[PDB]
C-alpha cells in the first residue's frame, strides 16, 4: 500500500512541477517596474510590454519565442532555450509514466530521476543566464541607466522569477525522491 502510494504522490508532484515549469516559461511577468522606473512595463524571456506614456499606460506588447529578431539579447535566447529543454525533459518523463506497464519500476524511476535532474540543471542554467541579459538597451531604457548585469536597479523580480526558483527546488527534490524510490522496493 505504502509503495504505490508514495509512487502516486511522486507522480502528482512531478505533474505539478511540470505545470509550474510551463507557467514560468510562458508568462512574461519575471521582472517588473517601480516608482523610480521612468517607463512602466514588464519583460520576461521573450515576451515584453513597455509603456508608451502618452496619457495612461497603453502598454505596447512585443516579443515571442517563435521570432528570434525580437529577443533583447542572446542571454535571454539561451535562457529560453534552456527552459525549453527543461519543459521537454519533464514532459518526456510524464510520458514515461505511461511506460510502467512494460518496463520494470526500478528502471523507469531511474530514468525519470536522471530526466528530472537534467531538467533541473537546464532550468538553473537558464535562471543564472537570465540576469546577464539585462544589459540590453531596451532593458536599460525601461528599468534605468544603473540597471545592468546582475543589477536590478529600479526594477524588481516579480512572482514568476521566484516561482522559477521554486520550480528549481521542486526539480531537485523530485529528482532525489525518484533516485531513492528506484533503488527502494
Amino acid at each position: 500500500r505504502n509503495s504505490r502510494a508514495i509512487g502516486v504522490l511522486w507522480a502528482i508532484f512531478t505533474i505539478c512541477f511540470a505545470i509550474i515549469n510551463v507557467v514560468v516559461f510562458i508568462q512574461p511577468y519575471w521582472v517588473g517596474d517601480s516608482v523610480s522606473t521612468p517607463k512602466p512595463g514588464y519583460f520576461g524571456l521573450f515576451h515584453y510590454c513597455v509603456g508608451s506614456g502618452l496619457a495612461g499606460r497603453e502598454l505596447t506588447c512585443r516579443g515571442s519565442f517563435t521570432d528570434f529578431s525580437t529577443i533583447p539579447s542572446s542571454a535571454f535566447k539561451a535562457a529560453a532555450f534552456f527552459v525549453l529543454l527543461s519543459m521537454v525533459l519533464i514532459l518526456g518523463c510524464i510520458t514515461c509514466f505511461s511506460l510502467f506497464f512494460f518496463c520494470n519500476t526500478a528502471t523507469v524511476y531511474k530514468i525519470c530521476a536522471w530526466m528530472q535532474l537534467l531538467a533541473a540543471l537546464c532550468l538553473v542554467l537558464g535562471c543564472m543566464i537570465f540576469p546577464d541579459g539585462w544589459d540590453a538597451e531596451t532593458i536599460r531604457d525601461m528599468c534605468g541607466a544603473k540597471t545592468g548585469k546582475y543589477s536590478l536597479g529600479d526594477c524588481s523580480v516579480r512572482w514568476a522569477y521566484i516561482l522559477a526558483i521554486i520550480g528549481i527546488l521542486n526539480a531537485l527534490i523530485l529528482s532525489f525522491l525518484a533516485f531513492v524510490l528506484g533503488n527502494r522496493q
Binding site: 510524464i94 510520458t95 511506460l99 512494460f102 533503488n183
Partner: protein, 51 residues
C-alpha cells in the same frame, strides 16, 4: 556508500542492461500516442486561454 550504494551503480542502472529491443513496438504503442497528446494539450493551452 552513504545510506545508498556505489555512486555509479546506485544512480546508473547499468546492471541487467540490452537485447530487449524486440519489445519496442509494445513501448511505442503507448509512448508515441501519449507524448503527442501531452504536446497537443500544452499547445492548445499555450494559445487559447493564456496567449
Amino acid at each position: 556508500c552513504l545510506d545508498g550504494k556505489d555512486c555509479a551503480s546506485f544512480f546508473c542502472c547499468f546492471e541487467d542492461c540490452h537485447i530487449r529491443i524486440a519489445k519496442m513496438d509494445s513501448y511505442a504503442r503507448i509512448f508515441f500516442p501519449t507524448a503527442f497528446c501531452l504536446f497537443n494539450l500544452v499547445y492548445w493551452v499555450s494559445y487559447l486561454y493564456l496567449g
